[PDB]
């Protein structure tokens, strides 16, 4: 609402209230083609997301928790003293590309590319996902993961050469038998536009996610509440 840096003001202004979100994913995992649509709202003031996702092609062929990181970090809450480090909002409204490779230990990998940008007043995240080399009897295609999600801190670093950011981090998915399925993420983000962006000092994001079901919904779906806060600069 009041920042002495006009570049920060420009990005904050687009995220000042509740912003509607649309998520589209087209996926192919070991030749099972599927699509997911999601709708909800983001409130960057509190770092809060609320989304509901539907598999529009029938039953989702992989477990919903494996898609949480893939299915909008511009809604992170950056403390006032860290707002000059917020790459994600500084790239708006033209947006950014978010690319990942996700390696599931002892199993296959996801390769994702997403464009995150405004269409009018709506923040859209449009994703293509390709998954290969998964085991039919593994934890992913065998749906052995529990329907829950662990809190996680992720380290963000600038990539000055690409005018973007980079991160590598591990997600632990609980398996029904009490064990864990590791998912190693590599991520890079680059701006879509050619204007300047804020390139951050090293810092981390703290995330927490809660998964639930809509008791009146017959389609395969996931309801997601996420909180993300930046930290690590004193």
Residues counted in the chain:
234
- CATH classification at residue 97: 2.40.155.10
Residue 178 lies in a domain: yes
Specified resolution (Å):
1.6
Residue 12 lies in a domain: yes
Residue 25 lies in a domain: yes
Provide CB contacts within 8 A for 92, sequence distance 6+: 11, 14, 15, 74, 117, 118
For residue 67, give the DSSP letter.
Answer: G
Report the b/e string of 210-223 with b at 16+ CB within 10 A. Answer: ebeeeeeeeebbbb
Residue 90 lies in a domain: yes
- Structural domain that includes position 56: 6-231
Residue 68 lies in a domain: yes
Residues 201/233, Cβ–Cβ less than 8 Å: yes
The residue assigned the tokens 């996801």 is: 110
Q: What determination technique applies here?
A: X-ray
Residue 65 lies in a domain: yes
Residue 100 lies in a domain: yes
| β-bridge mates for residue 52, sequence order | 39, 223
Tell me the pairing of strands 18-29 and 122-132. Answer: parallel
CA 133, CA 227: separation in Å to the nearest integer? 32
Structurally, the chain folds into a number of domains equal to: 1
Provide CB contacts within 8 A for 178, sequence distance 6+: none
């Amino acid at each position: 609402h009041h920042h002495t840096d006009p570049m920060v003001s420009k990005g904050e202004e687009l995220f000042t209230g509740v912003v509607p979100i649309l998520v589209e994913l087209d996926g192919d995992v070991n030749g099972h083609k599927f699509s997911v649509s999601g709708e909800g709202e983001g409130d960057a003031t509190y770092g809060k997301l609320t989304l509901k996702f539907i598999c529009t092609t029938g039953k989702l062929p992989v477990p919903w928790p494996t898609l949480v990181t893939t299915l909008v970090l511009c809604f992170s809450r950056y403390p006032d003293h860290m707002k000059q480090h917020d790459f994600f909002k500084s790239a708006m409204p033209e947006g950014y590309v978010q690319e990942r490779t996700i390696f599931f230990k002892d199993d296959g990998n996801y390769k994702t590319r997403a464009e995150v940008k405004f269409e009018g007043d709506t923040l859209v995240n449009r994703i293509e996902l390709k998954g290969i080399d998964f085991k039919e009897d593994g934890n992913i295609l065998g749906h052995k993961l529990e329907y829950n999600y662990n809190s996680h801190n992720v380290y963000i670093m600038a990539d000055k050469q690409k005018n973007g950011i980079k991160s590598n981090f591990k997600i632990r998915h609980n398996i029904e038998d009490g064990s864990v399925q590791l998912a190693d993420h590599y991520q890079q983000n680059t701006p879509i536009g050619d204007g300047p962006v804020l390139l951050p000092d090293n810092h981390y994001l703290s995330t927490q996610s809660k998964l639930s079901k809509d008791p009146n919904e017959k389609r395969d779906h996931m309801v997601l509440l996420e909180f993300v806060t930046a930290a690590g600069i004193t």
